[PDB]
């Protein structure tokens, strides 16, 4: 958000936000799908890797390109710059690619069901299927996995180049005024380290937060539309939306409760680092002078460091117990809710696997948020360091 | 392997190895199991968590205690010490606990079969099953998981205390000779850091290597005895031990190729480090002088660091491609070997799952060793540093 890269620190981000909101609530809720009525959009979506060319996707590609083009051209004409190409279009492209990868994941999860239904048919009645059908299924799976691989690799390449461009832009800006910044202590290590640290950390946090929100908004409606086959839960009885509540409560309770029960550790780590540093400094003074380090004082300092380690070694047990117990029960909790439905003859082998996979992905989407917060505090420290060290 | 903790780096270790060899080739190949003939050993093993009190395990516990007792007491009498109790018995206990946890894993993998046979019967013919059987199966699984959790937590606690005792022992030994070691440059950082680094690194690599070998030696016979139901492979045809050969080849190829295709990276990391250090040093010189920092020289330094990062960014794509491709193919490869047998109706759902899980665990037992190597490199650097800095 500096002045050199990213055309302005003010109106730019606000304008981007407002225009994003206008576009989103013109498409989804306002019903832009009427555009699909002008074209011949059928509305049915295949399962193969031919999904990504049907008009229902191609209209969306056109809409995204049109919106981003208009927005970027406005700024290109209103207030020129030097890194406009990277700062606008690289960010738009990274957002798009994250969405695309989420969609590929959705496609594979949708593929799991026919395969296992076919396996069940094969096992129950040995005269009904041959091997060519299994070969066909493997073929379509490879068809999807290919594009997943290609997009992932190219995305990594482009992200790395973009981050280095941010670093070079603001290093150039700082060195443009080196003479007035000579005297302030720690200018060298600042200019050499904090620039890369800030750029990389902020990019990583932004991408992870966006991806978490996208995964949730893509995968909860599948749980809603699949919760029609599980009317009764083993202990509760009858709830309209038992599956959704159970998944949310289980994943939330796991991640949030483990985060809360292990909140007190970092302070203990501060204490350990401080006492060790005191030991080191006292030894450094003792190195050259023959009256500094005497067995009394070194004994006292080592007693302090030992006593401050044992506290951490004892508090770690709550966290260990909670983590291991949750990890062990998770292997069968997702399967525990589906006994009455299997007996009652509603879900086949192939709607067990989709349900397990969706549980897993919704659980994993509640993990990026605590990564985002953990990265955010780190980013705050460096932000204040780069702000104070500027006049 | 110092002189303070672990009495000697010579005869002690060699004696330990020789006694281990005698004990092992008296038990396995020489058949000490005839003690089971003296006692009323059943010879059969349950499936529940009631396994770990059966005579077959209790005899082994007695034998291990007796062997360790003889070995330890000979050294207690022959050549006394100060930390003998930790140095002998802590290591013996850590080895035993690692083996125990491997056995717990084997028990769970064996439990996976009856459960999925029951689920298949519930899906096919629902008049043969009732829900109480599902509840009983979940009960026995919890019965195993409980002891797994308890042993794991206690083991982590003991390992941490053992490492800290090693550190305090050699710290005390060094500080006994502080007066004569003052002049050697960089003594404070040595005494304050290398002790913890060396102890922790060596212990971690030893534990991981032992655990990998134990997993292989426990999980290969299961594949040998389970490959009797899979006579024909999809392309090869008929081969006496097709499953074992295919599993070994796939896992070894995966891990070894991923390792070899990416051997060049650390050198590039070092080059980047050195160029950045040069840039930092030049800026530090030019800070308080009005001539050292000049646009041409700093421009040259930055050009070097840019041109040298771009090479790593270009090379890393091959590693990305290999990694992602293997990670995506492994999803369905494990099930690709079982198509003719599923079709012909030989294996039931419940031996598909055992086989898949065994594939996963043998693949995960080829990943410890590659980490052991990387830990060994770090160990050796610190070893040479701490051996040069002793007269």
């Amino acid at each position, epitope marked *: 958000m500096f002045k050199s890269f990213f055309p302005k620190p003010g109106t730019f981000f606000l304008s981007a936000f407002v225009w994003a909101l206008i576009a989103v609530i013109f498409w989804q809720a306002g019903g832009g799908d009427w555009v699909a009525r002008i074209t011949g959009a059928s509305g049915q979506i295949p399962i193969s890797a031919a999904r990504f060319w049907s008009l229902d996707f191609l209209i969306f590609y056109a809409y995204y390109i049109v919106c981003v083009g208009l927005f970027a051209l406005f700024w290109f004409i209103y207030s020129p710059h030097r890194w406009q190409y990277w700062s606008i279009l690289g960010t738009a492209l990274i957002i798009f690619v994250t969405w695309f990868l989420v969609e590929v994941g959705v496609a594979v999860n949708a593929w799991y069901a026919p395969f296992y239904d076919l396996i069940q048919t094969a096992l129950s009645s040995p005269h009904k299927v041959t091997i060519e059908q299994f070969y066909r299924e493997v073929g379509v799976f490879l068809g999807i996995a290919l594009i997943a691989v290609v997009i992932s690799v190219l995305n990594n390449f482009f992200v790395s180049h973009y981050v280095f461009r941010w670093r070079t832009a603001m290093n150039e800006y700082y060195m443009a005024n080196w003479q007035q910044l000579r005297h302030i202590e720690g200018a060298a290590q600042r200019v050499q380290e904090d620039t890369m640290r800030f750029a990389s950390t902020l990019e990583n946090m932004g991408v992870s937060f966006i991806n978490a929100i996208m995964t949730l908004i893509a995968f909860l409606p599948v749980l809603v539309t699949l919760s029609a086959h599980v009317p009764e839960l083993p202990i509760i009885g009858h709830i309209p939306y038992g599956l959704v509540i159970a998944a949310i409560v289980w994943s939330l309770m796991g991640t949030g409760l483990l985060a809360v029960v292990g909140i007190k550790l970092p302070g203990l780590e501060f204490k350990n680092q401080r006492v060790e540093a005191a030991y080191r400094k006292e030894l450094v003074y003792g190195e050259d002078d023959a009256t500094r380090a005497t067995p009394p004082t070194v004994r006292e300092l080592f007693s302090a460091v030992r006593k401050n380690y044992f506290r951490l070694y004892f508090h770690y047990m709550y966290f260990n117990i909670a983590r291991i117990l949750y990890l062990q029960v998770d292997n069968v909790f997702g399967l525990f809710l589906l006994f009455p439905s299997i*007996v*009652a*003859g*509603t879900i*086949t082998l192939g709607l067990m696997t989709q349900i397990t996979n969706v549980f897993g992905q919704v659980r994993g989407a509640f993990q990026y948020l605590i990564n985002s917060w953990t990265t955010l505090v780190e980013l705050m420290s460096i932000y204040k360091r780069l702000r104070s060290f500027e006049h | 392997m110092f002189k303070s903790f672990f009495p000697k780096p010579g005869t002690f270790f060699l004696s330990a190895f020789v006694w281990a060899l005698i004990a092992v080739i008296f038990w396995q190949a020489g058949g000490g199991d005839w003690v089971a003939r003296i006692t009323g050993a059943s010879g059969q093993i349950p499936i529940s968590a009631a396994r770990f009190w059966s005579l077959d395990f209790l005899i082994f516990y007695a034998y291990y205690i007796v062997c360790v007792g003889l070995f330890a007491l000979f050294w207690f009498i022959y050549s006394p010490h100060r930390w003998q109790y930790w140095s002998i018995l802590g290591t013996a206990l850590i080895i035993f606990v690692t083996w125990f946890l491997v056995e717990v894993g084997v028990a769970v993998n064996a439990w996976y079969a009856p459960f999925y046979d029951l689920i298949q019967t519930a899906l096919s*013919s*629902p*008049h043969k099953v009732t829900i109480e059987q599902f509840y009983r199966e979940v009960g026995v699984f919890l019965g195993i998981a409980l002891i797994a959790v308890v042993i794991s937590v206690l083991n982590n606690f003991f390992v941490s205390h053992y490492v800290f005792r090693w550190r305090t022992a050699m710290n005390e030994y060094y500080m006994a000779n502080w007066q004569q070691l003052r002049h050697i440059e960089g003594a404070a950082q040595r005494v304050q850091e290398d002790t913890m680094r060396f102890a922790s690194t060596l212990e971690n690599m030893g534990v991981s290597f032992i655990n990998a070998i134990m997993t292989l030696i426990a999980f290969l016979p299961v594949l040998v005895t389970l490959s009797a139901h899979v006579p024909e492979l999809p392309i090869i045809g008929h081969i006496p031990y097709g499953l074992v050969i295919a599993a070994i080849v796939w896992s070894l190829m995966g891990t070894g190729l991923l390792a070899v295709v990416g051997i060049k990276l650390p050198g590039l990391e070092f080059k980047n480090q050195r160029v950045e250090a040069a840039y930092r040093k030049e800026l530090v010189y030019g800070e308080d002088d009005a001539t050292r920092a000049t646009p041409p020289t700093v421009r040259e330094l930055f050009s070097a660091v840019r041109k040298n990062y771009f090479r790593l960014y270009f090379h890393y794509m091959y590693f990305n491609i290999a990694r992602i491709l293997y990670l995506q193919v492994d999803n369905v490869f494990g099930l690709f070997l079982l198509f003719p047998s599923i079709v012909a109706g030989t294996i039931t759902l419940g031996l598909m799952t055992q086989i898949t899980n065994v594939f996963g665990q043998v693949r995960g037992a080829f990943q410890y060793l590659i980490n052991s190597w990387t830990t060994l490199v770090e160990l050796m650097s610190i070893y040479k540093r701490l051996r040069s800095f002793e007269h």
Partner: antibody
Amino acid sequence: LKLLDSGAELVKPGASVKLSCTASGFNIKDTYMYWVKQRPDQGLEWIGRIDPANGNSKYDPKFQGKATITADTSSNTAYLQVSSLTSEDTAVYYCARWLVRGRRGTMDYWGQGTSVTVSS
Amino acid sequence: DIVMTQSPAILSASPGEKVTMTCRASSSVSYMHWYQQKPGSSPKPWIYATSNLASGVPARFSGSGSGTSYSLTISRVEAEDAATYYCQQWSSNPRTFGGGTKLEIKR
């Protein structure tokens, strides 16, 4: 419980015929509904069954391709169709219900039978 | 197919005596049920899973056996037990009946 079958039927060699069995007093989502055939030699022969909740049906291999069993989950009813009738298909056909989920009471209840006379 | 043989194929008794019939399988089942068909009427279970007497039937019927050997026992026959008895196995997806043992009453 009650099961009502159709009436007696007379057919010409070559025609196909459909028989119905309607269930009043319970919910056919909780049971099986199989069909049994008894020739004039009183020995009993098993034809096939169906699971109305999802639709899986199973047949004796000898009768495969000769009979088709279906269920109407909306209004309690089950149907069986016989094709290519010959002179060896004169018998009596009984429907039945077997409790799988909801187990209490008598676990097997039989209908009454519909004679199917094939003649010219 | 699991072929099931029932003996004796024709029987007799008198009011007050005890009667047994045997229905021997051809492999392990664990799933045996016993029926009765009077003249001109549909069948009716007595014994479900070889021991569990179903809803109210006179307490003089009793079944026993396990593995591949099963017996039906009637304690004190009456004039109202002249019928034909079958035995059904259940543990496959062909299901095979028995041969039936016409019972008579002496007088």
